[PDB]
Amino acid sequence: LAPLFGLEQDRYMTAQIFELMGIKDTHKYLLPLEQYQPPEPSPMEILQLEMTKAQVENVQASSQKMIADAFDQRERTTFEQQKAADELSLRQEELQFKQE
Amino acid sequence: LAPLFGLEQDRYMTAQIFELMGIKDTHKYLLPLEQYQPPEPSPMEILQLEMTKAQVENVQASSQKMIADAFDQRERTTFEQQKAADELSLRQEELQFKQE
Amino acid sequence: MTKAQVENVQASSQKMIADAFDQRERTTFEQQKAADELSLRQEELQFKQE
């Protein structure tokens, strides 16, 4: 039932209790909800959110670096096959030279 | 209800209690809110915020270094393809030499 | 100690970009060497044709 028992309902309950016991409730710290501005968040949760964001971003960066190095190895194997083909062509050229 | 039960309301409540029991409240440590300056934050939370900022900045630095090395590997593969093309051109040059 | 730790954190953060720029300069130097090798290839072609 807390999702419905917001702030204004609790304030009205406490105010009714006071009226039953002490009438003037505005005389002190307690403020009429009409002029109660919301609290100003602190830098702690802000920097905590920033740290969590940086951590998840580093996680995604590592995840992408994995596939990056995978593609790098694939391209390196392709280049090695290319070098093998070039060496075969050079072998054929040397055969032509020897036969001439 | 705490967001409305600020400092001044609590001070008024305590002052009313005192008046009911002890009249002169200003005689001692308790100060009239009019001349109560806010507390001076300590270096502890400051250095903690600084450490959190440095940590998140290092996280972002690693995240960027990931893509940096990825682009480096991509450029290296491109350079390898360039070297393969150069070797093919040199093979054609050697073929021209042998045929001449 | 807290100051030294945060300073080391900033030092690592800067070293990251430092090594990044180093790799960039190394790739640039590799492209330069490739251009030099192409020029030497053209020189060898001139030699062979002469």
Author numbering:
A (entry chain J), B (entry chain K): 549 to 648
C (entry chain J): 599 to 648
Sentences from the paper on this structure:
Escherichia coli phage SU10 belongs to the genus Kuravirus from the class Caudoviricetes of phages with short non-contractile tails. In contrast to other short-tailed phages, the tails of Kuraviruses elongate upon cell attachment.
The tail is attached to one of the vertices of the prolate capsid, where the dodecamer of portal proteins (gp6) replaces a pentamer of capsid proteins. Furthermore, the wing domain mediates the interactions of the portal complex with the capsid. Because of the mismatch of the fivefold symmetry of the capsid and twelvefold symmetry of the portal, we characterized their interactions using an asymmetric reconstruction of the neck region of the SU10 virion, which reached a resolution of 4.6 Å. Residues 8–44 from the wing domain form a curved α-helix that lines the inner face of the capsid. Additional interactions between the portal and capsid are mediated by the wing domain’s stem loop. The stem domain connects the wing and clip domains and spans across the capsid shell. The clip domain of the portal complex reaches out from the capsid and enables the attachment of the adaptor proteins. An embracing loop of adaptor protein is wedged between the clip domains of a pair of neighboring portal proteins and binds to stem loops of two additional portal proteins positioned clockwise when looking at the portal complex from outside the capsid.
